[PDB]
Design an enzyme around this catalytic site. Structure first.
Site, short mmCIF file in Angstrom:
data_model
loop_
_atom_site.label_atom_id
_atom_site.label_comp_id
_atom_site.label_asym_id
_atom_site.label_seq_id
_atom_site.Cartn_x
_atom_site.Cartn_y
_atom_site.Cartn_z
N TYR A 139 9.52 -4.15 6.90
CA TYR A 139 9.44 -3.44 8.19
C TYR A 139 10.41 -4.21 9.04
CZ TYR A 139 4.95 -1.25 7.07
OH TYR A 139 3.92 -0.56 6.54
N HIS A 154 0.85 -1.14 0.00
CA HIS A 154 0.00 0.00 0.00
C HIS A 154 0.89 1.20 0.00
CE1 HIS A 154 1.43 -0.61 4.07
NE2 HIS A 154 1.06 0.61 4.40
N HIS A 158 5.48 6.65 -0.43
CA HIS A 158 6.28 5.47 -0.65
C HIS A 158 5.43 4.24 -0.45
CE1 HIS A 158 6.21 6.43 3.59
NE2 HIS A 158 6.65 5.23 3.91
N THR A 201 0.31 4.80 1.78
CA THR A 201 -0.53 5.52 2.71
C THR A 201 -0.78 6.90 2.19
OG1 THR A 201 0.60 4.37 4.46
CG2 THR A 201 -0.85 6.18 5.09
N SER A 235 6.17 0.86 1.28
CA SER A 235 7.09 0.09 2.08
C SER A 235 7.17 -1.36 1.60
CB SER A 235 6.65 0.15 3.54
OG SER A 235 6.62 1.49 4.03
N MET A 251 5.77 12.17 2.20
CA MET A 251 6.80 11.45 1.43
C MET A 251 6.20 10.14 1.00
SD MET A 251 10.35 9.65 2.49
CE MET A 251 9.42 8.39 3.33
#
Length: 179
Positions: free
Chosen positions: A120, A42, A115, A44, A117, A113
């Site tokens: 994690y 995803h 992005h 965000t 991901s 910003m």
């Protein structure tokens, strides 16, 4: 009747069916070599204040009814300094992408910003660099990659919960096309 429960919601833009497996495969492989919880790819676009269920639904309907499907472009795969920004695809700051992530009131100049991901994790500086290298090794054409974001998800994500066990998606919607 009065809703008294309030939580923080996050809003996610999801890649389309042509791009989602590609990201999942990469997420799965990096996650195996390095460490890490499993999550869906995803990008965000919003984090709310504390809202009742109703308020969140109304915020989500507005978000769905008014955001049109858009295209994001991968600038480069990059690394960061804490768990949620370990290894990620940093997107080009194009207009439509940037707009989705902004929530400045109608007539103002506010002066995000974006992005997606990939991993994690709390890694040593070296392990990080290595994971970044392995991302390009697992999928070299990454830089410049264009993909369609055509659905949003309304979620509850306690950013301090590194296990992700509490992360839950509440609702989903398809974005109408515009181009």
């Amino acid at each position: 009747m009065e809703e008294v429960k309030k939580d923080v919601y996050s809003v996610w833009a999801l890649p389309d069916e042509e791009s989602e497996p590609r990201f999942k495969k990469l997420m799965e492989a990096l996650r195996s070599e390095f460490t890490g919880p499993r999550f869906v790819p995803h990008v965000t676009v919003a984090v709310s204040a504390y809202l009742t269920a109703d308020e969140a639904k109304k915020m989500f309907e507005s978000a769905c009814d008014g955001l049109k499907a858009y295209t994001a472009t991968v600038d480069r795969v990059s690394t960061g300094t804490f768990f949620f920004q370990c290894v990620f695809l940093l997107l080009q700051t194009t207009p439509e992408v940037m707009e989705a992530g902004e929530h400045c009131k109608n007539h103002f100049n506010c002066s995000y910003m974006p992005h997606l991901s990939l991993l994690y994790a709390e890694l040593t500086e070296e392990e990080k660099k290595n994971a970044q290298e392995k991302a390009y090794t697992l999928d070299s054409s990454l830089d410049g990659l264009s993909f369609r974001l055509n659905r949003l998800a309304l979620c509850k994500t306690d950013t301090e919960d590194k296990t992700l066990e509490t992360w839950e998606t509440v609702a989903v919607c398809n974005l109408n096309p515009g181009s």
